[PDB]
Amino acid sequence: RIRKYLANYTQDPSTDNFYYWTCVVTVAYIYNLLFVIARQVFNDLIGPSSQSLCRFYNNSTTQVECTYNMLTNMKEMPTYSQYPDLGWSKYWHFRMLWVFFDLLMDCVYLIDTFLNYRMGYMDQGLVVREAEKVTKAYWQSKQYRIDGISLIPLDYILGWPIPYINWRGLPILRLNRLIRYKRVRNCLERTETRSSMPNAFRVVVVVWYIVIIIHWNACLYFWISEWIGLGTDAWVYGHLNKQSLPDDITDTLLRRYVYSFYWSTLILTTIGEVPSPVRNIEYAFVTLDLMCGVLIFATIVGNVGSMISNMSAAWTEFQNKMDGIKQYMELRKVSKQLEIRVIKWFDYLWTNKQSLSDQQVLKVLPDKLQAEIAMQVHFETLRKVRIFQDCEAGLLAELVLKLQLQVFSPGDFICKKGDIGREMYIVKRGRLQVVDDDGKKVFVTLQEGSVFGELSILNIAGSKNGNRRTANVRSVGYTDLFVLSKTDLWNALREYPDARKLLLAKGREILKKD
Amino acid sequence: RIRKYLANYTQDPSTDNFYYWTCVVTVAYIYNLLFVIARQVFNDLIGPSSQSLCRFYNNSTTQVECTYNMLTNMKEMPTYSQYPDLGWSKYWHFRMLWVFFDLLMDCVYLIDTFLNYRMGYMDQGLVVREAEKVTKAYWQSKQYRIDGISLIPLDYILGWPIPYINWRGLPILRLNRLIRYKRVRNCLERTETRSSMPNAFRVVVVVWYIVIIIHWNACLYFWISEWIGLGTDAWVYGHLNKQSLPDDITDTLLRRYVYSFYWSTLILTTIGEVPSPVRNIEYAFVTLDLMCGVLIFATIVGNVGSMISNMSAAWTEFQNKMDGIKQYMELRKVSKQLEIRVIKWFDYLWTNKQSLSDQQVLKVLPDKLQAEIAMQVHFETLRKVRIFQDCEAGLLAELVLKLQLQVFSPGDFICKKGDIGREMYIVKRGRLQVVDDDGKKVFVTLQEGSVFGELSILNIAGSKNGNRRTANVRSVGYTDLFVLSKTDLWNALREYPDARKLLLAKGREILKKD
């Protein structure tokens, strides 16, 4: 049953279902961040627990409950009288909605605590899936302290307005759900690997951080502006501030959050077009908040500057290389036709997205993975060279591991008649031809997969010709040859005696064949 | 006794007690910075030496001593009449507190002068601890000039308000204690080595510099605003500035320092929401101060941008390498299963915090320290290979100096049956197994510390097999093998003739044993 399915369960963290679970815990953490500091500071989000009483002149000035016309053009801020049961007779649907979402995110935290309990730790490469072993790995570690502080249910006791003991409600006691930050950091990292664009996702995560810090500073500004007193200064929120409440503007909860977000956006990006402070504690808060805004603006400028300089590094290294050899050509007074040819060759080098390098796979992959990336490209092409047909595959492994890439220009010759031939040519993505001394084509136009110079690698002393090419091979287009020198085949043939005997036999066969 | 303990004392600078002494001299320097410029400019810190006399209308307007109600809503600034003894009858406890802290930091400067006297200079690696030699090293150097200018006691003569000669007191003569900056630079550097995070400590030291420059500019602004005249312009401090003294704000010493700090924070971070200047000398000061604020803001932006770009260099070099070989794979049209395997291998490369490199310890350590970091890892594992048991340790030194690290993938074979075997495998943090041609396990599952291929390194010509593997070795998890080729053991065995005889003897023994 499902009880023994739970008793014999152990989660390993590398699947995609656990990654979607880390997305769910990231959603619950973002909820806990935003709406716990907003329900602490603003407190009309869970329904107003105090009736707003304005001073209204009709007859005489009486004290009556504020309508939306009494909050426009205020001469003084409305005073509050609490309800008997603190907004519970009329905002219970709001509070049951907030209690339902708090219980949903605490159920998400409970299921993440159980997945921390049956969590497969990686021992020696493989993951442990035995239940007692991951249980003792949990209890031997100190994950249960962070799982226990993040699940104290005391917000359900002392976080809602209780009318019987006249408790005003304290929703800052749900800040202990915010120390599950390792799961959100794991979800952001494992999304940053598999993303389509890592630099743009780093910038989107940085502006999500910026919106969260601006929101927390908005709640901090309205808490300080409520603790000092609303409408007592020209800096705090209220009627005496003419930016927060202008002429025909109602004072509502949306106006409070909208002006506090505008204040923290103008302070933390160092624009500062808000009213200047009046008292001393407002000067201390605005000075500390503007120094933090200078550091936040420098963080934004540094992250966007590193995002720009990371994605335009290959282009400026290309410009460094292009300017270096253009400086080398204009220092040495070369003809201009070669300069047209090399700049059109760099245009081909950009429009193929290549860099004349094998060095990235020569460096950063281990030699087994280098062997697999060698075999899944050139092995099926290098089985069809008609001398490597009946041979051992290990020699082919050492040969495909030692292939070299050369790119040619259109109209440019590879090797002329009467040249010291010591290389074998394997054509990839090109078209070669043999030409009868810049006249017509002789016999064949070598397409992709074909081979030229397989006779001048086996080193037969004087059968028909030793090592001369006896061909004028021309590239009609941009051709990407794959060349294998005589030294590499004779090293890999020095490691194989019987294959040396067999390749000498097949070479004498194909050389006495013509 | 303690007098001959002082006569035979010499301090070497590399201990931790001298580092805590440099922290004490840094504390005394920070005191001298902040409170010498604050006691010069503000001057109510040592007690007001002049009675504030407001114009108060009761009857008639009379001139009376200002209360805290007379400094709110001022129509003109209060004029000052000095005391007979200049605040000494009522602020002597404040001045004895300031004199006690000045004598405490000058005692710290005297003990640092004596530790400069008996300071052990480093001659040839070792430190000199002979007393006459460090005494002549002191007097031959010019440390005594900087120690003599930083200890003129003339602030105790002409830095306090003397009533008998009507001296107002000049606490800017204690600025000569500020040229002991080499000790503070040494303490900041030697804290920056041993810190937990060098980039964050560089940023914390930069914002300590920012708070100190903002404080010195606050004292400069209030000195210029006091020299021009308080309350004469709308730019200077006073009643005519409506930002400094608003409606219900008392003019106190805390209001002066708080508004001057707010002014220098808004100017030196180029926000500039302070009142615009009126006269010409205020325009000259605000123009120079805003150009210095542009350079300070560019310094903050440059330091935080270099802090960001230094700590995210390994990640973007990983992304350069990953994008380079992904470009190499998608240029060459490879199957997708190998692409899943290489991206999960880079996920393992990040989650082990490795980079497939020995090159950092191959480069930056000297060869003795490379030998020690070699011997304290692989020597105890390489003593247990059962052929290197009875051998000389120097050959083992040249062998552990030539070990190579290879990482494998789970399910991927190391070497199949019928392969050219020329390497010896030493397992670290992995689990290998021999499999009977992708069937069951044959005999053993090779755990950590075990060795495979120690028979195919000694090169015995035709006893049972020359150099074939005759095993299918599979990694079940991510395995970090340590491999030693035949070329490295035969180079280190070419340097040892008798060890070559002994390893041939033990190799023939273990090869005729089976």
Numbering used by the authors:
A (entry chain A), B (entry chain D): 104 to 161, 165 to 620
Question: Please, what does the article write about this entry?
Answer:
CNG channels open when bound with cGMP and conduct Na+ and Ca2+ ions into photoreceptor cells. The gating ring transmits cGMP binding/unbinding-triggered conformational changes in the CNBD to the TMD, where a cavity gate formed by two hydrophobic residues in S6 opens and closes. Cryo-EM structures of the Caenorhabditis elegans TAX-4 CNG channel carrying the analogous mutation, R421W, show that most apo channels are open. R421W disrupts this interaction, destabilizes the closed state, and stabilizes the open state.
Surprisingly, consensus 3D refinement of apo TAX-4_R421W cryo-EM single particles revealed substantial heterogeneity and suggested the existence of channels in both closed and open states. Further processing with an S6-gating ring-CNBD mask and focused 3D classification showed that indeed apo TAX-4_R421W existed not only in the closed state but also in an open state; the two structures were determined at 3.2 and 3.1 Å resolution, respectively, with C4 symmetry. The closed-state structures of apo TAX-4_R421W and apo WT TAX-4 are identical, with an r.m.s.d. of 0.50 Å when all visible amino acids are compared. In the closed state, R421 forms a salt bridge with E298 in S4 of a neighboring subunit; it also forms a hydrogen bond with Q425 in the A’ α helix and a cation-π interaction with W456 in the B’ α helix of the gating ring of the same subunit. The R421-E298 salt bridge is the only interaction between R421 and the transmembrane segments. The R421W mutation alters these interactions. In particular, the closed state is greatly destabilized due to the disruption of the R421-E298 intersubunit salt bridge and the resulting repulsion between the π system of W421 and the negative charge of E298. The intrasubunit R421-Q425 hydrogen bond and R421-W456 cation-π interaction observed in the closed state are also disrupted by the R421W mutation, albeit W421 still makes van der Waals contacts with Q425 and W456.
